[PDB]
Design a protein around this ligand. Structure first.
Ligand SMILES: C=C(C)[C@H]1CN[C@H](C(=O)O)[C@H]1CC(=O)O
Ligand SMILES: C=C(C)[C@H]1CN[C@H](C(=O)O)[C@H]1CC(=O)O
Ligand code: NA
Ligand code: NA
Lengths: 245, 242
């Protein structure tokens, strides 16, 4: 039986009881499909510290699901966990089951048109989920524009970084603020808020993948089952199902 | 030890420079190989796959077979990451994302794959035994199953040996070519009378291939992720797609 770590994020994982019946969502459907294909059984556990996976700056310790895998406290991570260089250095990822990018969530009708338009001003504050792949992207970026956006963010950190996608969306809906956010979530959000839009194109390019501890014999099997799910159009069906202004 | 890298000629991924050894070659994949070489600290010799194939099971052939038998350490090419290939070799994280789509002439009523499947006047096909054809052959999706029904009975007349043969087919007859969206994009920039019909029919990536169990898999994956996040892969694509 596999211990599966995960986290609540709509519509990937949400509360529907006891055990695995507690949950539903894209990632739950995916987990089910993989289970069927590979013939394993599993117990789902929500990550204890409510984190995704970042390395702390003072000490070199990892948190979240990543840490969970690193420590072998979980066999798999199934969540909208971005596949990043930093993370890929300490755990293994399956082939991606979803492709996305960082982008801008904002109100419609403004002249803000791209990351650059944001970066060269201070009237409109902007931000990201604290210690998520996105913020980490801006923090590690050596691209002038994004480096400057990180200077701005890090200097105004206390009031422009947030603890969740929902908090950020609320920030956009209750103040002059632009939320650097993952595009799939954006797409989900703008279906439900008619005055929210994606500003500009995709700032980068990444995938969501299943996480395994480094050197896990399940990374490959899982990657293969995911590839299969993609080829037979299952993942697209799960997308339509969970995403359907 | 210098690594042996298997690849294959395909514009603009790998082409003969207009020389000896690695100097003979240029392209997006050669640039990529150079970046990987710098990041991971290795030297290499580039070799074109003898049988000139990517990799299909009849026994495997092409670059996949080269990897399986340890005749090469890496495959760097526009090699689609697929279920069937992944069961026998290891792919790095993808350096490019794409999908099967349709290359056809402009100005027709054809707007989708289903538009092709439901008629017979316009013929259509794909590279034989490549990832695209294999996609259709194995598909349970009604439209794609029908297109495959069409194609398998006409294997000799609608299937081609290369993207190039397919493009000339599109240009010289009433024919639609099922092809990879990145190559379609490369092509529609040089023949303004050609176009993509519809959107992407599936989703896949190209990855660097390594023999199953190779310790280079992870390091290469990490380098590709690094290249992606600093914008280098995108710059390489802009460079070669214009
Ligand atoms: C839901 C948030 C906290 C997570 C989900 N994916 C990103 C991650 O893998 O860290 C984070 C969002 C982001 O940073 O844009
Ligand atoms: C150049 C062609 C023969 C290759 C390239 N990628 C696909 C592959 O990985 O097999 C093939 C094309 C295709 O199948 O549409
Ligand atoms: Na890893
Ligand atoms: Na594999």
């Amino acid at each position: 039986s596999l211990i599966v770590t995960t986290i609540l994020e709509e519509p990937y994982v949400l509360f529907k009881l006891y055990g695995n019946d507690r949950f539903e969502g894209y990632c739950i459907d995916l987990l089910r499909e993989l289970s069927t294909i590979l013939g394993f059984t599993y117990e789902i556990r929500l990550v204890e510290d409510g984190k995704y996976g970042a390395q702390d700056d003072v000490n070199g310790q990892w948190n979240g699901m990543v840490r969970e895998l690193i420590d072998h406290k979980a066999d798999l991570a199934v969540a909208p966990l971005a596949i990043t260089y930093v993370r890929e250095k300490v755990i293994d990822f399956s082939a991606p089951f979803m492709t996305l990018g960082i982008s801008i969530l904002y109100r419609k009708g403004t002249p803000i048109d791209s990351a650059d338009d944001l970066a060269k001003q201070t009237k409109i504050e902007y931000g990201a989920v604290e210690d998520g792949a996105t913020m980490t992207f801006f923090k590690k970026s050596k691209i002038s524009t994004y480096d400057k956006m990180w200077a701005f963010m890090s200097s105004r950190r206390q009031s422009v970084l947030v603890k969740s996608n929902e908090e950020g969306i609320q920030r956009v809906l209750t103040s002059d603020y632009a939320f650097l956010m993952e595009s799939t979530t954006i797409e989900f959000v703008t279906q439900r808020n008619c005055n929210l839009t994606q500003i500009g194109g995709l700032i980068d390019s990444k995938g969501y993948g299943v996480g395994t501890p480094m050197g896990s014999p399940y990374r490959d099997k899982i990657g293969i089952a995911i590839l299969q799910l993609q080829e037979e159009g299952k993942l697209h069906m799960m997308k339509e199902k969970w995403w359907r202004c």
